[PDB]
Amino acid sequence: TRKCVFCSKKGQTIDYKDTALLRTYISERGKIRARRVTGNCVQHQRDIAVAVKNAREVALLPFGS
Amino acid sequence: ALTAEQKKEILGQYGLHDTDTGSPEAQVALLTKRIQDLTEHLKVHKHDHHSRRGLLLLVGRRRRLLKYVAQVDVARYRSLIERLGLRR
Amino acid sequence: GSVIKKRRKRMSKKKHRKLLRRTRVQRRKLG
Amino acid sequence: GIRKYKPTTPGRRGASVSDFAEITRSTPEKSLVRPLHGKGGRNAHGRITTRHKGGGHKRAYRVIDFRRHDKDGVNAKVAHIEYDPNRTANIALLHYLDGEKRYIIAPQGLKQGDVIESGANADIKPGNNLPLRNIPAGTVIHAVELRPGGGAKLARSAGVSIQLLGKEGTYAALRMPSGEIRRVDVRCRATVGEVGNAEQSNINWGKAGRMRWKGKRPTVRGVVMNPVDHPHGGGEGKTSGGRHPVSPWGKPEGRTRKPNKPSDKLIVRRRRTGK
Amino acid sequence: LERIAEHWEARRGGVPAEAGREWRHESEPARRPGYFPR
Amino acid sequence: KNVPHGAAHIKSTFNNTIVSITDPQGNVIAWASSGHVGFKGSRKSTPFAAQLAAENAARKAQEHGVKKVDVFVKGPGSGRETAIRSLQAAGLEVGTISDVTPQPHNGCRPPKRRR
């Protein structure tokens, strides 16, 4: 299918501060993209979702623009 | 649960030799410390039933270990009971 | 299992509960 | 808390007493005690102007510092928490660092040994007193002034608190314990926290004797009087008063606040009933 | 006569209704675009 | 007044459609409703009634000096696209389309299902 870019040897750590790394993972509506269309493992999907929520809380990402 | 430091000092106090971790005395001492910590935790959170179930499990395990010690040698059982301040 | 048995049991239970409701004060005063 | 009496006598069946757990001393401070005598509900003419008063235990007045405005920047330590017969709340005895002792109504959660500061530079811990301008919006306050210098008037009963809604201009909007929303000048000072002894309302007094100790005389219903005494009086057998309910002086029920008061402009919305 | 009623109370349960639900014989067919959804 | 640029808010529910041409600052200058053009009851949930209401509102804004509008569509789809087309067909240039439908993040309790 697709590639879990976070399990790789160059898998960048997931943060709620790096906004672009998360912007690549939310749809144009600001919703969190599903795991299948993304392809990452369940642990990394949970990390992505938690980071997105944290970033929304500190007004780094829109709450569904 | 307990961190490594309390585990080591308790084991040094109650371990039969300087290596054993699975002797009934060591297991009972560790269980006693864990039970006291859990009791003080549950004094504040009275509605943490899930942790209370784990407390019950620990109490049962300690009871079984003390039963084994008493059936093996009553002198060790009396010594441990008086050293740890337990009733029965 | 057929729901017929459940229906018979439920009609019995419903009738008994109705009877209990109809004689609450009488039972309380006799006991 | 609340201690419940066992039904040993018919007068103690459902009764309960306050559990004086926060009290740390059974005597008042001698230098802060003033004499108090009962009036019997009678004014300067010797006439009963308030019914159902008289009798009751002797009590002495403790001077309460409702005007905490001179000890700005001077810290105090909570020395004791005491019982006050003149109010539902308890009082805390403060030891100021300069050597002065005072009384304040004890806020909720205050403990012996705490540190109480006051002024614009104080923290927002319970018991601290600062002008409303320096108190952030949304906090819970008590013992609020009405004019800048008149002393605390609002939110003084046990368990009662005021919620500070927001400040605009020179006015801060507050939500009274009654639910009424009011505006007050920001220069008015207030104390942070709720008032303690919040469970005192749940006390079952048990017998008429306790109310007589508290200084309440029995109340006679107007329907069992004669028409010369009460508008509801008269009639053979029991009756409902034979008319719309009225006061003993004939005034009918309804709003009694005087219209066009000067304070009508300072009130956002009055309290509500039946909602 | 009970089975014959045919007034509104008799046929309110049979009305296909069920918006996008309970496919019935007279249920409204779904409108379909010319192009594939993708 | 003379507002050359404006906003059109279309609310299409399951039994009505409300059009209100609005000054970009949020002030309403001309509104038309599905029942305002002579329909009533179940008749006003039809796309044709939405078309009539949209055209009526478009005219009532056009004599007010409104030439260019942006549309904020909203509500379950009943006559939304017909309303947009009738807005364009009545001499109004429709620039941008935005679907602003209030989407709760799982908040209040919905009413019970009908049977």
Binding site: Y16, K17, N54, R56, E57, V58, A59, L60, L61, P62, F63, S65 | - | - | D123, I124, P136 | - | -
Partner: protein
């Protein structure tokens, strides 16, 4: 003595040159408590995704701190009391 990361948003009105000293006085509670350490970083004047307390602009700050759980709560409580702080957030940079 656990490592924390504390992100604060300060209102945009105040001068950016006074942010660095003003924070340092705020972190005096963690410094004096139990021999703790900070690494204060500033990247301010960034527009918010949504309006916060009638503000669209904001000055972001990131503080990396290693203190006692009681200490950091005390620092957090003071920060929210201050009116120059719009919002704040405390993370544990441990495995949590």
């Amino acid at each position: 003595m656990r490592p924390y990361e504390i992100m604060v948003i300060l209102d945009p009105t105040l001068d950016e040159r006074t942010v660095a000293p003003s924070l340092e006085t705020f972190l005096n509670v963690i410094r004096k408590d139990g021999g703790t350490v900070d690494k204060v970083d500033i990247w301010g004047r960034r527009r918010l995704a949504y309006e916060i307390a009638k503000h669209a602009e904001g000055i972001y700050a990131v503080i990396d701190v290693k203190a006692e759980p009681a200490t950091v709560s005390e620092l957090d409580r003071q920060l929210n009391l201050n009116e120059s702080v719009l919002r704040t957030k405390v993370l544990r940079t441990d495995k949590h």
